[PDB]
Design an enzyme around this catalytic site. Structure first.
Site, PDB file in Angstrom:
ATOM      1  N   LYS A 192      -9.058   3.068   2.406  1.00  6.50           N
ATOM      2  CA  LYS A 192      -8.158   3.005   2.868  1.00  6.50           C
ATOM      3  C   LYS A 192      -7.828   4.122   3.785  1.00  6.50           C
ATOM      4  O   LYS A 192      -7.253   4.196   5.021  1.00  6.50           O
ATOM      5  CB  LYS A 192      -6.668   2.708   2.286  1.00  6.50           C
ATOM      6  N   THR A 206       0.214  -1.157   0.285  1.00  5.63           N
ATOM      7  CA  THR A 206       0.261  -0.057   0.159  1.00  5.63           C
ATOM      8  C   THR A 206       0.931   1.518  -0.515  1.00  5.63           C
ATOM      9  O   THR A 206       2.351   1.026   0.541  1.00  5.63           O
ATOM     10  CB  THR A 206      -1.223   0.381   1.051  1.00  5.63           C
ATOM     11  N   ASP A 266      -3.885   5.012  -1.668  1.00  5.48           N
ATOM     12  CA  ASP A 266      -3.943   3.908  -2.673  1.00  5.48           C
ATOM     13  C   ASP A 266      -5.246   2.697  -2.244  1.00  5.48           C
ATOM     14  O   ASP A 266      -5.485   2.991  -1.257  1.00  5.48           O
ATOM     15  CB  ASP A 266      -2.570   3.013  -3.578  1.00  5.48           C
ATOM     16  N   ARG A 321      -5.614  -0.476  -3.417  1.00  5.94           N
ATOM     17  CA  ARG A 321      -4.945  -2.108  -3.574  1.00  5.94           C
ATOM     18  C   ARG A 321      -5.188  -2.706  -2.669  1.00  5.94           C
ATOM     19  O   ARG A 321      -4.662  -2.249  -1.955  1.00  5.94           O
ATOM     20  CB  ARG A 321      -3.580  -1.802  -5.063  1.00  5.94           C
ATOM     21  N   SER A 367       4.973  -0.538   1.443  1.00  8.68           N
ATOM     22  CA  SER A 367       4.922  -0.618   0.888  1.00  8.68           C
ATOM     23  C   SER A 367       6.106   0.543  -0.505  1.00  8.68           C
ATOM     24  O   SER A 367       6.812   0.178  -0.762  1.00  8.68           O
ATOM     25  CB  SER A 367       5.244  -1.708   0.664  1.00  8.68           C
ATOM     26  N   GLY A 406      -0.004  -2.675   8.393  1.00 10.33           N
ATOM     27  CA  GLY A 406       0.311  -3.419   9.001  1.00 10.33           C
ATOM     28  C   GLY A 406      -0.562  -5.005   9.322  1.00 10.33           C
ATOM     29  O   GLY A 406      -0.530  -5.422   7.862  1.00 10.33           O
ATOM     30  N   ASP A 422       5.716  -0.348  -7.703  1.00  5.89           N
ATOM     31  CA  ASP A 422       5.369  -0.971  -6.193  1.00  5.89           C
ATOM     32  C   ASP A 422       4.049  -1.892  -6.804  1.00  5.89           C
ATOM     33  O   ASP A 422       3.560  -0.889  -7.142  1.00  5.89           O
ATOM     34  CB  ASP A 422       5.442   0.201  -4.352  1.00  5.89           C
ATOM     35  N   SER A 436       0.976  -1.803  -4.210  1.00  9.58           N
ATOM     36  CA  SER A 436      -0.216  -0.088  -4.751  1.00  9.58           C
ATOM     37  C   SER A 436      -0.475  -0.136  -5.998  1.00  9.58           C
ATOM     38  O   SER A 436       0.682  -1.212  -7.175  1.00  9.58           O
ATOM     39  CB  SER A 436       0.958   1.176  -5.227  1.00  9.58           C
TER      40      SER A 436
END
Lengths: 144, 208, 191, 245, 249, 236, 205, 142, 241, 186
Positions: free
Chosen positions: B49, B17, B33, B35, B145, B63, B182, B185
């Protein structure tokens, strides 16, 4: 406790308990002979077959419990009740580190002659013939 | 409270994320994001989120997802009760203190990492919160990430004098970089803008 | 420890073996792997020494208390559910111990036999068959089982299973104790 | 005087009056009687006449089985007897679990008396307004046992005992008609004696009498209304024949 | 020990009545009048403000409290007990319902929780019963609008319209003569103002009476925009200016 | 006497418990409730005592559901009744969870009666002061009707009444009860007894709560159904 | 030190001088080799003229500092302005009584009209030491010699500022976990003064 | 002045350590039936293999309260912790509700948790026992 | 008076009253002194009357004005032991609030907290209420100048201005008349010294017979600090009109 | 007797939902009114969760005097799972239903500690790695009539079965009015 052979059986009017008194020498001299069987009461006997301290201590404690029960009920305790007390006590500490295998032998009017085997794992087995020791197959065969 | 039953049983069985927060001259912006991945598989291509502690205090987490949701909801309930009790608008410092002490109590066993933004009668506030109970202040923060790409974008184009539009664009660009570079994401960009003296504006799927 | 259970048209047949704890020469005549829960419900257990007997006697005491209190007998289904609850509760805060339970009863209200198996984690399954201990018998049971078998045919099937099992036991397999639970209560087969 | 307001106060003459008041509460309950035979025990109870709209199939009986070999009857407050009976049953099962031996009659009597005594040791609790009769046989024994327990925690052993309302008349009748030298040697004689003892206070007859019989090897039987009616009719016929002469 | 217990403060009188509950009811009847009116589109809850001195700021102390965004309450009796019970109700709405089901409780269940708390105070060894009476107005999806009254003993009943306090009998009669199944929220507000006019001895203006409504959702009170499915609060407390304007009309 | 009635844990010199007696006396201040068990169901009826205008009749102060097979009629304080009703519901669910079977009625009745008796035996607790009429069906005894009072005693009945006019209602029920009645006959008898024993001018629908249990389902009557049955029976 | 936690790798200095005390630090927070926070204020205030800097676990030191500030507010409500020794004692008690579960090190600087500026250091373990100056952190090891060669008692304010700036610049130059800007707080009788120095200034020293 | 609870392990064990559930037949042994724990739970098994955070969570609030009392003693005197403890003990001792387990309102006010919620609040949570009389016996000490 | 019970504990009388609470109220006038609280534009002033009839007393140790936190001051009407008990508990409450919620305790929230404790005392049988009346003054960062009063019954409320004591009615009437004349709920002055002088003048014209510098106690709350004035400051205020 | 492990599939139609489970009687799908729950994992935990949710839904119906909706039941399942944060049940639960007041379909899935995944198209549990997830992805289409939805879910289960013991399936098709339960013992 010595892993020497210990035998117990019940024939017609009591219980025969047999041990070998070949003591093992060390850095000591004994004032008198040792005994491999604990005298719990004038009517009860036990065998060590494990950790010596555990057997001595807890069978003296069992003798105290049986004495208190007999004082309370004005009657001799049954062998089943005494073996059950010992088994419950050892089970409460199961896995803590104790090690003891004992044979409770008794004779009462209501039950007759009775032998139980109590282990530190909580096992409690009623039986007619018990042979626990280093070499016990030979003794069991001779008995049978 | 939380139970420890079947811990020994579970041990016996086993033995056999992108999130960004930016600050501008009259408020804060928080973006994320959309996803959701259950490993390598994309579970949901449009997942929210950004979570609301209070109408003008928002947060986004990483986490353990269940821990993040539960901690955010519990602190929201506490904030609502406290605001009713004091008859005052909730403050970001109060939520920060509650979160910090709750996370310190559990000694890091609750895996929630948070970015918390908000406005209150004292101004605009942005904080980062760690799972072990440590918190920090900042002008721009990233999490997840994809946080390194987002932080590169933030370090490229951040300055003290930012208007609302520039801040929104910068946060969107950071989330876009996280999305492109990434694997964790992707998809859309959700934004929430909080200004001093106005209602919070929650823009779901802002750019796409 | 080996336990077998077979449910037939009118009864439940339970077979259990002896203990032979650890290198102790014991001559005795009793069944230490079976507790009578109620006049029409029997329980067989196999597992770790000490823990399993404690659990079985605790269950028996609870069921006897219920029977005295209500002047009424629980159905085998309710007994099995209570046993499952207690087993799952025992390992709530301790390392699980090996235990497997076969509960065989005869529902008088429904007038039909029932058999349940509960494993060490607390999984209860209603079955027409059942075995725990030595690990083939499932294939033979699947090949030679009918839901409408009589008691004699069930006993013959159990004898076939015992004969098959004896050829792999290390010749110390003594007499397997066999009990039958039906509408007349619980009895023990001499053979 | 000012000495009956608590359980922890002695009167100047050495009495605790709340214990006597609990006994007074017991005195208002329905009569219960227990007769010890040569090889059996008989517990008889008086029942208030059933109301017309009362469902006489589900209401608890006056004699409760604590275990397969011990029975218990009470006199006094009906709701406290449920608590005492439940505790007695739990204790019997606990003793079987702990010592593999079922309780003796005296042990269960002592446990019940202990509960009653323990409920007299606080100023925030109320003692049970119940007096109990406990009957049975020790396991693998053939000596009948009958005991009485009181609200204070005192228990006694009797060959025949009555508690409850108008129990003095029944006790006098038993003293006149019962001798320990020659106890009734059959169940029929014991049941007939119990029926005749209850008939001295029972207003109507066979429909206000309940009888339970305990025999060795855990044989507990509750007699039906027809058998009690037969006993009552036989007693009445014998009385009429005696009076006719 | 003699301190391991404490005897019950509420006991039955020989006539079969619990004296402490009756005295709490008397204390309620000595309080200021409050009322509630249930309409087709909302519920009106109203009360009379009181002041020890004119120098007190009546807006600091509010007898009308939001329990949930869709549930509010008003009182007759003793204020501190009100404050304690309102705090407890606000906490229970979250601990028992919103942390379990993700949604606020219906009106009846919150009333039941409050009533249980009040009942537990009449079977105690060291607290007296709450000397207060409660009016709770609310709305929920599967039950519509509702109005409840809760007594010091913990009994609660639903009402179409009711009043508690010093002038409760006359207000009850006036509401009996002025209620129907087709009333609207504005009509209910007007009736409530007329009913309160008969009980206030002093100044009947916007700074001495307190009103609140359970009506339609107010998205302008949410504090955030962007979620079309997020409903605004239905509880709304009328300002003093609005009350003055309605009184002039 | 005033010396022996202040505390619940003290016996009078005659062996009486005055707080329990006062709790029993408090029952007569409540509306009458009647339970009648017929050969194919059970009927519960209750007369509301505090009936007046401006009261929401559609939204129940005397008839409650414990589970899908047991219902209760309440006479006395309603808050204590709600406490005991929630306790009984939790107990029934506990029995279902433990045994995977529905709890027998008598077990639940005995549990609640034990709770009441315990509440008569502690200095810091007063008696509940409620009376329950239990109507249930179980696979052991079939249809059954029980009553329980604040003292903790419970009794089984064929037809029973609690509340304000127990004596007159019981007299009427004794004079008019038949063992072989149907549910409709029991409904008629309960309504007629309530109409005769009531102290109001007339027995209308807004002063009645009605419930039935029959093969098994529980029907809690709405006000329209109550009005329809009142019209049918001729009481109107 | 629990796995996955945050550690306070830093460079902390506290120097007593003629008119009072000065506390200085860097502004870098790192997780591994990544600079998680480029601009951090490490100068924690527990009372108006009692400040501290923290080392070890960040969460543990934050909790301890919160408790200390609460304790000093209670003390002030009762008895007035506390001494630096009292704050140091409370810090020491908190750090020592929990040393089996928390990893905390504290440098406390304070001023009062009685003792006239003091420095205390509580290293890991919970022992307390009073020193004319103190250094702590991962970057302090590289300036043990330099400081020992350049400290004088009763220096002026400007000399103390220059000394702290030079020492922290060297620690920044050599320690990876240290960098950013230099922050300083001057505690005297005239009040509290805040100073910040940028890399383009101190790197040319 | 403790933050994390300390000294949570037992130092001695015995078969009569639980005074509430003791066998009447053998008073030195516990009563397995009335424990109602599954019947196969020896006390020794409770001495090993526990989750490390369980003791920290179970004793957290008591530890914070003790630290607060110690601070009051240090700064205010003996009287302040004495009065706080007296208030809390009076409130706790006068409450006896066998049918409910919730904490009182006054206890929450004294603990300063009127508008605070923790997982203990959200998650407050047989053949023998669990009745009113067992609670009466445990409360009265009889 | 109370007939049976209600003479010891707080339970309802047949009239629905709590006699112990009312007696605790009557206990608040034992000291027979008065206090006044007014609000300025950016300050709040409390003025209390000092009576030291004994010549052996040390006047500097006689005070009913307490400092609770950096911004909150308190004035107590009633006996000094319960006053000091309440002061210590209020200090603890303010400090704990600051620790737990991360910002300073407002005056009204502290007043509500003390009132909730008083409610505990009014409902519990084995607890007695404190026979004192508490008045908290501050300059809240949101609400500006603030005066809030709490009483033994657990009732608290905020005031534009307030007075308490055996002669509170006269001061209340004088303040009400002044606020009617000025049509402003505060005092329009830019310094707290003028507000203090106005409060002294109001006290003088209400009580009568005037006083010297040793018969008065003055506390002033600003946006940053609450502070008590000394005898010389009060002397300067008396001299300066 | 094995039992442990399984698969659960939930799919959303136009005005209907479908929920299906594998089968060897132990069934992994339960209902609490008009809400259906399928549980994969340890058999003990499946039975325990079923009993607990039956308990809680019975109490909910007795209190609220109405049946619980799928969204509220989803929240209840999440909170119940999170209660056992450090001793969690080894379960994957899936919830399917139709909201009575609005009529909209609803499906959701949970992790073992209560994290909610609300999917608009389909949810696979038990083993969504080998072939079931890919088959559902290749077979699912939105806004399908109940017959089409039943065909799609049955075909997905049948294709998964071929990827040799006695295998069966249980399928529920739920609409606002009625629920149809079928077996696929093939």
């Amino acid at each position: 406790a010595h892993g020497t052979t210990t035998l117990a059986f019940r024939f017609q009017g009591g219980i025969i308990v047999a041990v070998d008194s070949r003591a093992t020498a060390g850095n000591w001299v004994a004032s008198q002979t040792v005994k491999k069987v604990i005298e719990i009461n004038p009517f009860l006997l036990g065998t060590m077959a494990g950790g010596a301290a555990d057997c001595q201590f807890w069978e003296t404690w069992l003798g105290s419990q049986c004495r208190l029960h007999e004082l309370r009920e004005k009657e001799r305790i049954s062998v089943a009740a005494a073996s059950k007390i010992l088994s419950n006590l050892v089970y409460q500490y199961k896995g803590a580190g104790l090690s003891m295998g004992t044979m409770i032998c008794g004779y009462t009017r209501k039950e007759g002659p009775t032998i139980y085997y109590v282990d530190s794992d909580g096992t409690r087995l009623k039986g007619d013939i018990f042979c626990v020791g280093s070499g016990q197959t030979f003794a069991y065969g001779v008995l049978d | 409270g939380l139970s420890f039953d079947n811990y020994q049983r579970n041990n016996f069985l086993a033995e056999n994320t992108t999130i960004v927060g930016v600050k501008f001259n009259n408020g804060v912006v928080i973006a994320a994001d959309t996803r959701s991945t259950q490993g390598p598989i994309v579970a949901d291509k449009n997942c929210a989120k950004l979570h609301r502690i209070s109408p003008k205090i928002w947060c986004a987490g990483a986490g353990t997802a269940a821990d993040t949701e539960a901690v955010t909801q519990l602190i929201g309930s506490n904030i609502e009760l406290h605001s009713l009790y004091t008859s005052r608008e909730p403050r970001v410092v109060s939520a920060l203190q509650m979160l910090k002490q709750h996370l310190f109590k559990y000694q890091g066993h609750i895996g929630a990492y948070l970015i918390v933004a908000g406005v209150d009668p004292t101004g605009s506030h942005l904080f980062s919160i760690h799972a072990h109970g440590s918190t920090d202040v900042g002008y721009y923060l990233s999490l997840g990430s994809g946080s390194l790409a987002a932080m590169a974008v933030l370090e490229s184009h951040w300055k003290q004098d930012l208007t609302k539009e520039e801040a929104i664009k910068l946060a969107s660009d950071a989330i876009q970089a996280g999305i492109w570079n990434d694997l964790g994401s992707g998809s859309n960009v959700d934004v929430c803008v909080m200004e001093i003296g106005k209602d919070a504006e929650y823009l779901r799927n802002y750019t796409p | 420890d080996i336990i077998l259970g077979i449910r037939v048209q009118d009864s439940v047949i339970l077979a259990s073996s002896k203990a032979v704890t650890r290198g102790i020469s014991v001559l005795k005549d009793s069944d230490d792997k079976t507790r009578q829960l109620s006049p029409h419900t029997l329980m067989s257990f196999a597992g770790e020494a000490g823990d399993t007997v404690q659990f079985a006697e605790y269950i028996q005491a609870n069921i006897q208390l219920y029977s005295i209190r209500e002047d009424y007998e629980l159905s085998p289904q309710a007994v099995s559910s209570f046993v499952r609850q207690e087993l799952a509760k025992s390992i709530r805060s301790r390392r699980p111990y090996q235990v497997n339970v076969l509960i065989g009863g005869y529902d008088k209200k429904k007038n039909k036999p029932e058999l349940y198996q509960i494993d060490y984690l607390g999984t209860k399954v209603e079955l027409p068959y059942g075995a725990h201990g030595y690990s083939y018998t499932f294939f033979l049971l699947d090949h030679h089982y009918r839901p409408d078998m009589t008691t004699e045919e069930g006993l013959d099937l159990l004898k076939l299973c015992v004969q098959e099992l004896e050829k792999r036991m290390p010749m110390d397999f003594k007499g397997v104790i066999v009990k039958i639970v039906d509408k007349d209560g619980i009895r023990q087969v001499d053979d | 005087s000012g000495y009956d307001r608590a359980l922890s106060i002695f009167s100047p003459d050495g009495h605790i009056f709340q214990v006597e008041y609990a006994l007074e509460a017991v005195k208002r309950g329905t009569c219960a009687v227990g007769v010890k035979g040569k090889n059996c025990v008989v517990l008889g109870c008086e029942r208030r006449s059933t109301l017309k709209l009362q469902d006489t199939r589900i209401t608890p009986s006056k004699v409760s089985k604590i275990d397969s070999h011990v029975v218990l009857s009470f006199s006094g407050l009906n709701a406290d007897s449920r608590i005492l009976i439940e505790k007695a049953r739990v204790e019997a099962q606990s003793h079987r679990l702990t010592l593999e031996d079922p309780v003796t009659v005296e042990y269960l009597t002592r446990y019940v008396a202990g509960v009653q005594q323990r409920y007299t040791q606080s100023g925030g609790v109320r003692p049970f307004g119940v007096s109990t009769l406990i009957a049975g046989f020790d396991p693998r024994d053939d000596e009948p046992k009958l005991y009485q327990t009181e609200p204070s925690g005192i228990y006694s052993s009797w060959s025949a005992q009555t508690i409850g309302r108008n129990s003095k008349t029944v006790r006098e009748f038993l003293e006149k008609n019962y001798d320990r030298k020659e106890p009734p040697a059959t169940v029929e004689e014991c049941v007939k004696l119990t029926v005749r003892s209850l008939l001295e206070v029972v207003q109507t007859g066979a429909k206000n009498i309940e009888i339970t019989v305990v025999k060795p090897d855990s044989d507990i039987v509750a007699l039906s209304s027809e058998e009690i009616n037969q006993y009552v009719t036989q007693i009445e016929q014998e009385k009429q024949e005696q009076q006719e002469q | 020990m003699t301190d391991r217990y404490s005897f019950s403060l509420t006991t039955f009188s020989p006539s079969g009545k619990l004296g402490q509950i009756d005295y709490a009811l008397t204390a309620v009847k000595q309080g200021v009048t409050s009322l509630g009116i249930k309409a087709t589109n909302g519920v009106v809850i109203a009360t009379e403000k009181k002041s020890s001195s004119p120098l007190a700021m009546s807006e600091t102390l509010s007898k009308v409290s939001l329990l949930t965004p869709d549930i509010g309450a008003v009182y007759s009796g003793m204020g501190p007990d009100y404050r304690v019970l309102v705090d407890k109700s606000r906490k229970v709405a979250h601990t028992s319902y919103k942390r379990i089901y993700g949604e606020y409780p219906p009106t009846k269940l919150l009333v039941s929780e409050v009533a249980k708390i009040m009942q537990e105070a009449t079977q105690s060894g060291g607290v007296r019963p709450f000397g207060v009476s409660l009016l709770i107005a609310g709305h929920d999806e599967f039950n519509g609008f509702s109005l409840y009254q809760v007594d010091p003993s913990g009994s609660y009943f639903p009402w179409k319209a009711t009043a508690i306090g010093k002038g409760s009998v006359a207000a009850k009669t006036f509401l009996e003569k002025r209620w129907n199944d087709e009333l609207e929220l504005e009509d209910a507000i007007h009736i409530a103002l007329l009913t309160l006019k008969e009980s206030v001895e002093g100044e009947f203006n916007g700074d001495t009476i307190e009103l609140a409504i359970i009506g339609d959702e107010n998205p302008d009170l949410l504090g955030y925009t962007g979620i079309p499915t997020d409903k605004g609060p239905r509880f709304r407390k009328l300002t003093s200016q609005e009350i003055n304007d309605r009184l002039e009309a | 006497s005033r010396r022996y009635d202040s505390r619940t844990t003290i016996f009078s010199p005659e062996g009486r418990l005055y707080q329990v007696e006062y709790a029993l006396e408090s029952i007569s201040h409540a509306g009458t409730a009647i339970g009648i068990m017929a050969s194919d169901g059970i009927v519960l009826a209750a007369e509301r005592k505090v009936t007046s205008t401006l009261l929401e009749q559609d939204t129940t102060e005397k008839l409650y559901k414990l589970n899908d097979k047991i219902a209760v009629a309440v006479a006395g304080l309603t808050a204590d009744a709600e406490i005991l009703i929630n306790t009984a519901r939790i107990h029934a669910q506990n029995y279902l969870k433990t045994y995977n079977e529905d709890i027998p009625v008598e077990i639940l009745v005995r549990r609640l009666s034990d709770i009441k008796q315990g509440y008569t035996q502690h200095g810091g607790l007063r008696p509940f002061g409620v009376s329950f009429i239990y109507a249930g069906y179980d696979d052991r005894y079939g249809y059954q009707l029980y009553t329980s009072n604040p003292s903790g005693n419970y009794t089984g009945w064929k037809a029973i009444s609690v509340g304000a006019n127990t004596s007159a209602a019981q007299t009427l029920l004794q004079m008019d009860y038949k063992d072989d009645m149907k549910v409709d006959d029991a409904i008629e008898l309960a309504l007629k007894t309530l109409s005769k024993t009531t102290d109001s001018s007339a027995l209308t629908y807004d002063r009645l709560e009605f419930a039935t249990i029959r093969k098994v389902y529980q029907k809690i009557f709405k006000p329209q159904e109550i009005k329809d049955i009142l019209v049918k029976t001729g009481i109107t | 030190l629990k796995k996955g936690e945050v550690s306070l790798g830093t460079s902390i200095m506290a120097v007593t001088f003629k008119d009072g005390v000065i506390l200085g630090a860097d502004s870098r927070t790192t997780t591994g080799a990544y600079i998680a926070n480029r601009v951090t204020d490490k100068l924690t205030r527990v009372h108006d003229k009692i400040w501290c800097c923290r080392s070890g676990s960040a969460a543990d030191t934050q909790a301890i500092a919160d408790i200390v500030q609460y304790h000093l507010e209670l003390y002030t409500s009762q008895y007035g302005t506390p001494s630096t020794e009292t704050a140091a004692s409370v810090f020491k008690e908190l750090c020592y009584e929990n040393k089996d579960n928390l990893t905390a090190g504290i440098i406390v600087a304070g001023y009062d009209d009685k003792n006239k500026g003091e420095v205390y250091t509580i290293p890991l373990g919970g022992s307390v030491h009073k020193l004319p100056y103190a250094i702590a952190g991962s970057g302090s090891t590289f300036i043990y010699g330099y400081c020992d060669k350049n400290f004088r008692e009763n220096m002026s304010k400007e000399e103390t500022v220059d000394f702290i700036k030079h020492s922290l610049s060297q620690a920044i130059k050599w320690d990876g976990s240290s960098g950013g800007v230099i922050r300083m707080v001057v505690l005297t009788a005239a009040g509290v003064e805040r100073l910040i120095f940028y890399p383009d200034e101190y790197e040319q020293l | 002045m403790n933050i994390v609870p300390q000294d949570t392990f037992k130092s001695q064990v015995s078969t009569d350590q639980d005074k509430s559930v003791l066998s009447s037949a053998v008073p030195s042994l516990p009563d397995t039936l009335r424990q109602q724990e599954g019947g196969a739970v020896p006390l020794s098994t409770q001495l090993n293999d526990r989750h490390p955070l369980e003791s920290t969570l179970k004793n957290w609030e008591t530890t914070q309260r003790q630290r607060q009392m110690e601070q009051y003693r240090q700064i205010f005197g003996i009287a302040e912790p004495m009065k706080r403890t007296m208030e809390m003990e009076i409130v706790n001792r006068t409450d006896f509700n066998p049918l409910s387990t919730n904490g009182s309102i006054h206890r929450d006010i004294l603990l300063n948790k009127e508008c605070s919620i923790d997982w203990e609040d959200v998650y407050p949570g047989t053949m023998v026992g669990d009745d009113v009389h067992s609670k009466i016996e445990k409360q009265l000490g009889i | 008076s109370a007939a049976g019970y209600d003479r010891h504990i707080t339970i309802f009388s047949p009239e629905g009253r709590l006699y112990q609470v009312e007696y605790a109220f009557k206990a608040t006038n034992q000291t027979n002194i008065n206090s006044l609280a007014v609000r300025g534009k950016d300050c709040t002033v409390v003025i209390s009357q000092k009576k030291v009839p004994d010549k052996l007393l040390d006047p500097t140790t006689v005070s009913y004005i307490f400092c609770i936190s950096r911004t909150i001051g308190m004035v107590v009407n009633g006996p000094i032991p319960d006053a000091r008990n309440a002061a210590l508990r209020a200090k603890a409450e303010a400090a704990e609030f600051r620790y737990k919620y991360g910002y300073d305790m407002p005056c009204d929230v502290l007043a509500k907290r003390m009132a909730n404790l008083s409610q505990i005392y009014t409902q519990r049988a084995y607890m007695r209420p404190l026979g004192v009346i508490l008045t908290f003054v501050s300059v809240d960062e949101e609400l500006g100048p603030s005066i809030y009063k709490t009483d033994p019954a657990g009732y608290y409320v905020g005031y534009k201005a307030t007075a308490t004591g055996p002669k509170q009615q006269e001061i209340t009437t004088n303040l009400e008349n002044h606020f009617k004349k000025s049509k402003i709920d505060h005092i329009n002055e830019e310094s707290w010294e003028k507000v203090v002088e106005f409060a002294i003048t109001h006290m003088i014209d209400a009580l009568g017979t005037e006083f010297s510098k040793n018969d008065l106690e003055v506390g002033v709350a600003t946006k940053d600090k609450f502070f008590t004035l000394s005898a010389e400051n009060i002397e300067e205020r008396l001299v300066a009109i | 007797s094995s039992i442990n492990g399984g698969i659960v599939v939930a799919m959303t139609g136009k005005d209907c939902v479908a929920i299906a489970c594998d089968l060897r009687k132990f069934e992994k799908i339960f209902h609490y009114g008009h809400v259906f729950l399928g549980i994969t994992g340890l058999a003990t935990d499946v039975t325990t969760l079923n009993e607990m949710f039956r308990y809680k839904t019975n109490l909910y119906k007795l209190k609220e005097e109405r049946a619980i909706e799928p969204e509220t039941f989803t929240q209840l399942v999440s909170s119940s799972l999170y209660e056992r944060r450090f001793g969690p049940y080894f379960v994957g639960p899936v919830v399917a239903g139709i909201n009575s007041k609005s009529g909209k379909p609803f499906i959701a899935g949970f992790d073992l500690i209560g994290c909610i995944d609300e999917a608009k198209d389909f949810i696979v549990s038990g083993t969504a790695s080998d072939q079931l997830f890919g088959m559902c992805e290749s077979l699912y289409e939105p806004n399908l009539e109940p017959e089409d939805l039943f065909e799609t879910i049955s075909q997905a289960l049948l294709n998964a079965a071929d990827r040799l013991s006695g295998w069966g399936a249980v399928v529920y098709i739920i609409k606002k009015d009625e629920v149809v339960k079928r077996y696929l013992k093939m």
